[PDB]
mmCIF file of N, CA and C in Angstrom:
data_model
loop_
_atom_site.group_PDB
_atom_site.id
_atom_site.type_symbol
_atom_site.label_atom_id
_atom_site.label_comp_id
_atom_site.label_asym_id
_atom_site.label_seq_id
_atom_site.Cartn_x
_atom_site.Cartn_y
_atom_site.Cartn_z
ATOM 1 N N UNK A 3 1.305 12.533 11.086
ATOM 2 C CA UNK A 3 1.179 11.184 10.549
ATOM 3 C C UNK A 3 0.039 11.101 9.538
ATOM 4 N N UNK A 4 0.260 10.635 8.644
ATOM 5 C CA UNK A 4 -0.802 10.578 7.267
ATOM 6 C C UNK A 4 -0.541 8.998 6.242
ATOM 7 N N UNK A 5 -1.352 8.297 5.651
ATOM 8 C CA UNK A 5 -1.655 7.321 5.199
ATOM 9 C C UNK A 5 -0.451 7.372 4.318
ATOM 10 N N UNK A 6 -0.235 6.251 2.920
ATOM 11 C CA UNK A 6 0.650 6.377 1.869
ATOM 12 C C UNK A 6 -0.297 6.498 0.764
ATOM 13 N N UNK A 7 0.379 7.012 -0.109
ATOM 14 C CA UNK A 7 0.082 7.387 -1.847
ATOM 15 C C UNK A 7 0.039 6.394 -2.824
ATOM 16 N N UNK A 8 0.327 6.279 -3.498
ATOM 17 C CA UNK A 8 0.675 5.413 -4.714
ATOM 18 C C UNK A 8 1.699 5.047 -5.139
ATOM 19 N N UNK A 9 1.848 3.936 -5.331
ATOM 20 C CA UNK A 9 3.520 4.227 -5.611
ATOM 21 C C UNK A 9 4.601 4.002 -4.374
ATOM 22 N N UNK A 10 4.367 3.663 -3.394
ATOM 23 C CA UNK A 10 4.535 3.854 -2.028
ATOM 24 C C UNK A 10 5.367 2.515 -1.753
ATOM 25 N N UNK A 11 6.256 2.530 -0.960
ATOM 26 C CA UNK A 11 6.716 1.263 -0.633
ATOM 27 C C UNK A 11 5.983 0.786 1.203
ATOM 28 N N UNK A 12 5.584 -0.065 1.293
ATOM 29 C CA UNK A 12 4.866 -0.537 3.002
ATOM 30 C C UNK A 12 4.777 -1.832 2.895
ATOM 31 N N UNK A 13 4.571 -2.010 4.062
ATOM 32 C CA UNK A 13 4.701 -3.078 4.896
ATOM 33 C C UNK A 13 3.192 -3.940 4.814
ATOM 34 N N UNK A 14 3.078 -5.369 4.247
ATOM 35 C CA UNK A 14 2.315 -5.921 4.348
ATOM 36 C C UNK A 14 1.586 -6.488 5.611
ATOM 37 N N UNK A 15 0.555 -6.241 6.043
ATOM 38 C CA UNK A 15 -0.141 -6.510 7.232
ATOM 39 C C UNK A 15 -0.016 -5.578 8.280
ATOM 40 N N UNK A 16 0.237 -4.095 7.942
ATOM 41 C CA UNK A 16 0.057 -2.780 8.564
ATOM 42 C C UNK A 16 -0.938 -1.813 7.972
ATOM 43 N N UNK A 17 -1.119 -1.284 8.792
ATOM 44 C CA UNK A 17 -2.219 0.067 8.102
ATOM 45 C C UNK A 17 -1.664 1.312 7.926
ATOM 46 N N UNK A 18 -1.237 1.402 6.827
ATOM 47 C CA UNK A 18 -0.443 2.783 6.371
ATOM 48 C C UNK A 18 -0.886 2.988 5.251
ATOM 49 N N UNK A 19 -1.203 2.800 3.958
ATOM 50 C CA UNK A 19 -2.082 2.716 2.867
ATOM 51 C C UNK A 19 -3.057 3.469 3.316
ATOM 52 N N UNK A 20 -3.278 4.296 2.020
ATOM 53 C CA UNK A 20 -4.469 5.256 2.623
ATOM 54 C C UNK A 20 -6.150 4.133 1.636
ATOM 55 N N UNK A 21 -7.019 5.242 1.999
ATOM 56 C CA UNK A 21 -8.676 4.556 1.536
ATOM 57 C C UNK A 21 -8.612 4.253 -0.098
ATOM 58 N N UNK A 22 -9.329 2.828 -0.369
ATOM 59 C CA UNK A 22 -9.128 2.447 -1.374
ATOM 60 C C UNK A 22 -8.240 1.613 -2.002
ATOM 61 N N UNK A 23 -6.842 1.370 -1.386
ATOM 62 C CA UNK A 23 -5.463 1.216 -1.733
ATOM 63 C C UNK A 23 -5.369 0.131 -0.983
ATOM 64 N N UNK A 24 -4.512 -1.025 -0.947
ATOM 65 C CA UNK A 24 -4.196 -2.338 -0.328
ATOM 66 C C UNK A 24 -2.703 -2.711 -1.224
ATOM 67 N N UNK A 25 -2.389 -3.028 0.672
ATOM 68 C CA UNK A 25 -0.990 -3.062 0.699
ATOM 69 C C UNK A 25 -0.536 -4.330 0.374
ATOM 70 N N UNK A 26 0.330 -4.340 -1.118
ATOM 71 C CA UNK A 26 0.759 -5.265 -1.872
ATOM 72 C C UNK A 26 1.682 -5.991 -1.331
ATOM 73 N N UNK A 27 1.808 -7.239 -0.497
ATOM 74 C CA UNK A 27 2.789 -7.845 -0.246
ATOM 75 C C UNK A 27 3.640 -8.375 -1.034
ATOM 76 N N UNK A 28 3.041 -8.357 -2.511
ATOM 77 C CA UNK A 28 4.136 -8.895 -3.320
ATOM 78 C C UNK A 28 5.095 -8.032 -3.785
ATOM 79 N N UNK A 29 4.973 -6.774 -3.878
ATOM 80 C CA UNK A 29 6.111 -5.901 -3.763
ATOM 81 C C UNK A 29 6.125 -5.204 -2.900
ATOM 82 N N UNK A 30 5.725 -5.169 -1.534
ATOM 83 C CA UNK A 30 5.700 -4.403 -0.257
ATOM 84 C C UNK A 30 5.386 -3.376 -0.985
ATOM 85 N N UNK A 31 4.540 -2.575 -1.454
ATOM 86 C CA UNK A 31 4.058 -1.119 -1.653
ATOM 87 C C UNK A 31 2.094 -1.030 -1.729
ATOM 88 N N UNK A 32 1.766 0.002 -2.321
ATOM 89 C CA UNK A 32 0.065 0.396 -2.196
ATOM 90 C C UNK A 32 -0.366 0.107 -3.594
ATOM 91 N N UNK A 33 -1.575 -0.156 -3.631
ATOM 92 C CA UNK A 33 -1.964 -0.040 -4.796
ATOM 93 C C UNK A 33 -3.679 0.002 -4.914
ATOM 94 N N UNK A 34 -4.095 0.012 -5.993
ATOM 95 C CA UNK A 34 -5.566 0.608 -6.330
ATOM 96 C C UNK A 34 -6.364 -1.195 -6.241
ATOM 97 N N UNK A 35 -7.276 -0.731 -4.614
ATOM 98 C CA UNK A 35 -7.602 -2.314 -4.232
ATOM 99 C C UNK A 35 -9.096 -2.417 -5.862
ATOM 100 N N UNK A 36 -8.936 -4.100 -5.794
ATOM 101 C CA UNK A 36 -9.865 -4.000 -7.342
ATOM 102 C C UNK A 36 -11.202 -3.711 -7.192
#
């Protein structure tokens, strides 16, 4: 089991997104937190 990447599709209000990254509920995926 390992975090997600970039680009990633997840689930808003789970911890799967790896460090740095926050999980975009507006398109359910990861992205580069600001």
């Amino acid at each position: 089991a390992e975090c997600k990447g970039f680009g990633k599709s997840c689930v808003p209000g789970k911890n799967e997104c790896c460090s740095g990254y926050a999980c975009n509920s507006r398109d359910k995926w990861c992205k580069v937190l600001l």
